[PDB]
Design a protein around this ligand. Structure first.
Ligand SMILES: COc1ccc(Br)cc1S(=O)(=O)Nc1ccc2c(c1)OC(C)(C)C(=O)N2
Length: 134
């Protein structure tokens, strides 16, 4: 009768790894471009801020976020992965960006502010990707 299910509480999941000693890794000119050009251009953009860290669903009062998004990804994670030389090739890093944008389009509705932000960042992303060293 007197248990009202006020605990236990929700939480954020553990964030994506940014280190893994047994993962194969390389430094490539494409991955260096991804850090110096692609990530740094997106990072400084005035629409970057919702994407600069793992989604804090507790702070943002988004209790459904990690019910819907099971492969979370953010630019904070990507930045740390690039700084730690985590990737084997450019494809792995690009796929992380694609995951981040796709999550946003899954979770939100066309025309939401967050979606307008993601769309503009995707546009910049694809512009810089078309100049990837070959
Ligand atoms: C009402 O909260 C808003 C409204 C517009 C904008 Br832009 C940002 C916010 S919020 O940062 O306070 N909350 C928020 C609300 C929803 C989203 C979100 C943030 O960003 C992630 C990437 C989690 C997302 O996909 N959707």
């Amino acid at each position: 009768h007197h248990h009202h299910h006020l605990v236990p509480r929700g939480s954020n999941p553990p964030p994506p790894e940014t280190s893994n000693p047994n993962k194969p890794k390389r430094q490539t000119n494409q991955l260096q471009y991804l850090l110096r050009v692609v990530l740094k251009t997106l990072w400084k953009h005035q629409f970057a801020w919702p994407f600069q860290q793992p989604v804090d669903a507790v702070k943002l009062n988004l209790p459904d976020y990690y019910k819907i998004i099971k492969t979370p990804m953010d630019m904070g994670t990507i930045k740390k992965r690039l700084e730690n030389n985590y990737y084997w090739n450019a494809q792995e890093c690009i796929q992380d960006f694609n995951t981040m944008f796709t999550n946003c389009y899954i979770y939100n509705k066309p025309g939401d502010d967050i979606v307008l932000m993601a769309e503009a960042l995707e546009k910049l992303f694809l512009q810089k990707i078309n100049e990837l060293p070959t």
